[PDB]
């Protein structure tokens, strides 16, 4: 059964913890094990207390996120349908105890530097259960990189990586992310010039432009094996479908329109919608350190604009990857 925090986070690992994200779900810390950054996602479960204004998940209610995390991580090791484009999962632990004071330290630093929407997680008792997910460190989200990318060539690499990753997960797992807003796309330096994927036994490469993309956050995600479907049933959620101020909140409505409010079904067109929303962010809200000044550059720009105009007439990330001119 469950282990103390110290089994996941021995002192040295606790001491190098630094907070890098948060949600209603809980907290994400970066730390170092064997000279290697990792991301620790910590989720309180099974307790009656509100956390960040919401009821804690049960073990059952958190299983889907663990299952989907695992399935997508394992694609990096598969043969017919292989991608590294989802965040690697290193380990999952069920932990019991009060929140480590050293994590409160890191939580405070973050709250005074960047400010938190969360409760200070200091009210947990020594019986409190958490799930600790240890992920590879995927880098920084596209939203925080709004002003940080080199050029629209980078934008194309990112759309290519995302399209291939989703297409491999479509082919393998009948996967839909269902929440791939620009907070859920992480970017990391790679020295690899070419990134590799395999779709239904056919291997290809994507120019990195120095970035490795990692997809994160499976809150809303859906996939299946041998006809067992893991999905988040939002048929009755009301809030999710009433946002505005961003194309993001249209996608929730366009998904529900596409799937007739049946979230158990496979509608890979949801992945096309999210890729459309991301293409839209690339063209409208990203600002690049270099514009498209030279001929070849304006070419790429027109191709991404042509992608923006055309991609919604494709049925899946698989259909885009295989049939869209952007990728040829
Ligand atoms: C199921 N799942 C897989 C990753 C995630 C997630 C959620 C929120 C946040 S906020 C920051 C990260 C993160 C950053 C860097 N490297 C990995 C994860 C993050 N990761 N959830």
Domain boundary among 108, 137, 166: 137
What's the total number of domains in the chain? 2
Q: How far apart are alpha carbons 229 and 174 in whole angstroms?
A: 9
> Do residue 275 and residue 158 come from a single domain?
yes
Report the residue among 26, 31, 36, 41 best suited for mutation to probe ligand 1: largest number of ligand atoms under 8 A from its CB: 41
Q: Considering Cα of 19, then 88, then 86, then 60, what sign does the dihedral take?
A: negative
* Residue of 78, 191, 213, 221 lying closest to 136 (CA atoms): 213
To one decimal, the resolution in angstroms is: 2.2
Backbone torsions φ then ψ of 6, nearest 5 degrees: -65, -30
Indicate if 146 and 124 belong to the same structural domain.
Answer: no
Which CATH number does the domain housing residue 303 bear?
A: 1.10.510.10
Question: Cα 40–42–47 angle (5° rounding)?
Answer: 170
DSSP track, 54-121: EEPBPHHHHHHHHHHHHHHHHGGG-SSSB---BPPEEEEEEEESSPPHHHHHHHHHHHHHT--SSPPS
Pocket test for ligand 1, best of 27, 28, 211 (most atoms within 8 A of CB): 28
CA 90 remoteness from chain centre: 16
Instruction: Determine whether the shortest distance from the Cβ of 39 to ligand 1 is under 6 A.
Output: yes
Instruction: Mark which of 82, 115, 137 sits at the end of a domain.
Output: 137
Q: Are residues 302 and 158 in the same domain?
A: yes
Identify any residues that bridge with 204 across adjacent strands, giving them in sequence order: 197
Q: Are residues 21 and 170 in the same domain?
A: no
Structure tokens at 295: 């001929």
Statement to judge: residues 274 and 148 lie in one domain: yes
Please tell me the distance from the alpha carbon of residue 142 to that of residue 158, in angstroms, as a whole number. 10
Residue ending a domain, choose from 80, 104, 137: 137
> Could you give the CA distance from residue 261 to residue 235 in angstroms, rounded to a whole number?
5
- By residue count, the chain amounts to 328
Give the determination technique. X-ray
Query: Any binding-site annotation on 219?
Result: yes
Question: 184 is in which domain, residue-wise?
Answer: 138-328
**Ligand 1 close to Cβ of residue 107 (< 6 A):** no
Residues 218, 111 within the same domain: no
What are the backbone dihedrals phi and psi of residue 146, each rounded to the nearest 5 degrees, phi first? -45, -40
Task: Give the gyration radius of the chain's Cα atoms.
Answer: 20
Report the separation in Å between the CA atom of 91 and the middle of ligand 1, taken as the mean of its atom positions: 14
- Is 69's C-beta closer than 6 angstroms to any atom of ligand 1? yes
Give yes or no: residues 191 and 253 share one domain. yes
Strand partners for 147: none
Q: Quick one: 167 and 131 in the same domain?
A: no
Same-domain status, 241 and 298: yes
Q: What DSSP element (H or E) covers 110?
A: helix 101-113
30/161 same-domain check = no
Residue 245 known to bind ligand? no
H-helix or E-strand spanning residue 198 = strand 194-199
Residue 284 — φ and ψ, nearest 5°? -115, -35
What is the token pair recorded at 169? 């997960």
């Amino acid at each position: 059964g469950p282990v103390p925090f110290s089994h996941c986070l021995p002192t040295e690992k606790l001491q190098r913890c630094e907070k890098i994200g948060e949600g209603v779900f809980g907290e994400v810390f970066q730390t170092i094990a064997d000279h290697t950054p990792v991301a620790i996602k910590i989720i309180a479960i099974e307790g009656p207390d509100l956390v960040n204004g919401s009821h804690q998940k049960t073990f059952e209610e958190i299983l889907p996120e663990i299952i989907i995390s695992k399935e997508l991580s394992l694609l990096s090791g598969e043969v017919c349908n292989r991608t590294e484009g989802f965040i690697g999962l290193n380990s999952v632990h069920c932990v019991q105890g009060s929140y480590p004071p050293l994590l409160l330290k890191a939580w405070d630093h973050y709250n005074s530097t960047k400010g938190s929407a969360n409760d200070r997680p200091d009210f947990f008792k020594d019986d409190q259960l958490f799930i600790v997910l240890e992920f590879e460190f995927g880098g920084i989200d596209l939203e925080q990189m709004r002003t940080k990318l080199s050029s629209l060539a980078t934008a194309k690499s990112i759309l290519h990586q995302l399209t291939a990753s989703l297409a491999v997960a479509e082919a393998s797992l009948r996967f839909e992310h269902r929440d791939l807003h620009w907070g859920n796309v992480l970017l990391k330096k790679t020295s690899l010039k070419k990134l590799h994927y395999t779709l239904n036994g056919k291997s290809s490469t994507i120019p990195s432009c120095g970035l490795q993309v990692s997809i994160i956050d499976y809150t809303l995600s859906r996939l299946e094996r041998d006809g067992i479907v893991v999905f988040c049933d939002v048929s009755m959620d009301e809030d999710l479908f009433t946002g505005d101020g961003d194309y993001q909140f249209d996608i929730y409505r366009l998904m529900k329109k596409e799937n007739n409010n049946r979230w158990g079904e496979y509608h890979p067109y949801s992945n096309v919608l999210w890729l459309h929303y991301l293409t839209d962010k690339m063209l409208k809200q990203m600002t690049f350190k270099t514009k498209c000044n030279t001929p070849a550059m304006k070419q790429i720009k027109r191709k991404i604009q042509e992608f923006h105009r055309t991609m919604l007439n494709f049925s899946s990330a698989t259909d885009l990857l295989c049939q869209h001119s952007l990728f040829k």
